[PDB]
Amino acid sequence: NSFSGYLKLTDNVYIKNADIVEEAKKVKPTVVVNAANVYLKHGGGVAGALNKATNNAMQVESDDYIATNGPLKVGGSCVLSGHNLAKHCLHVVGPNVNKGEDIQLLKSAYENFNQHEVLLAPLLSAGIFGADPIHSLRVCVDTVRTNVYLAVFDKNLYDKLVSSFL
Numbered sequence: 756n757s758f759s760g761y762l763k764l765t766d767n768v769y770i771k772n773a774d775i776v777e778e779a780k781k782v783k784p785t786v787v788v789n790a791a792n793v794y795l796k797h798g799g800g801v802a803g804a805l806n807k808a809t810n811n812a813m814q815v816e817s818d819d820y821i822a823t824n825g826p827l828k829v830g831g832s833c834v835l836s837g838h839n840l841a842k843h844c845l846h847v848v849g850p851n852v853n854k855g856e857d858i859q860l861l862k863s864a865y866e867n868f869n870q871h872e873v874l875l876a877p878l879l880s881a882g883i884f885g886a887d888p889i890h891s892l893r894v895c896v897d898t899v900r901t902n903v904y905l906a907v908f909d910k911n912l913y914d915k916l917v918s919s920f921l
C-alpha cells in the first residue's frame with residue numbers, strides 16, 4: 756500500500772491520474788478493485804486491463820468461481836486472488852445504466868469497498884456502463900468509509916473530477 760502522488764479529497768478518499776494496472780504493480784496493494792460484470796468476463800476496459808496484466812489468470816479463476824457460485828448480482832461483489840497485482844481482487848458490479856439498470860445500485864456497489872480497510876480502485880460504472888464519472892465519484896465519497904485510492908487513467912476526466920471536488 757505504498758501509494759504516492761495521490762490528492763486527498765476527503766478524510767478517506769484519495770485520487771491520482773494513473774493507470775490502475777501500473778499502480779497495482781508498483782503499490783502491491785492488499786486489495787485492487789475490478790469494475791466487473793456479473794459473469795466476470797474481463798474482455799475490455801479496466802477488467803480487460805487487469806486480466807491482461809495477469810496473463811488471463813484472473814479470467815481462468817473467475818470462470819471457475821462462476822461455475823461454482825453463479826453470476827454476481829448487480830451491486831454485488833466477490834473476493835478472488837489478486838495474482839501479481841494485489842493480494843486480493845475485489846470484483847464489483849456497478850449498474851449498467853446504459854442498459855437501464857438503476858443508478859441507485861451504484862451505492863450498493865461502493866458499499867462492498869467497506870469490507871476492506873484499504874483499496875486501490877477505479878470509478879465504478881464509468882466505462883462502458885455509462886454512468887457519469889463525476890456522479891460516481893460523489894457516490895464513492897458519500898458511501899465508502901474505508902480508505903480508497905482511486906486511479907483515473909484519463910487526465911481530462913481527472914482534471915474535471917478535481918475541479919468539481921475542489
Ligand SMILES: Nc1ncnc2c1ncn2[C@@H]1O[C@@H]2COP(=O)(O)O[C@H]2[C@H]1O
Pocket residue numbers: 789790791792796797798799800801802803849878879880881882883884885
Ligand atoms: N469488452 C469490455 N469492454 C469494456 N469494459 C469491459 C469489457 N469486458 C468487461 N469490462 C468491464 O466491465 C465493467 C463494467 O463497468 P465499468 O464500465 O465501470 O468498467 C467495465 C470494465 O471494467
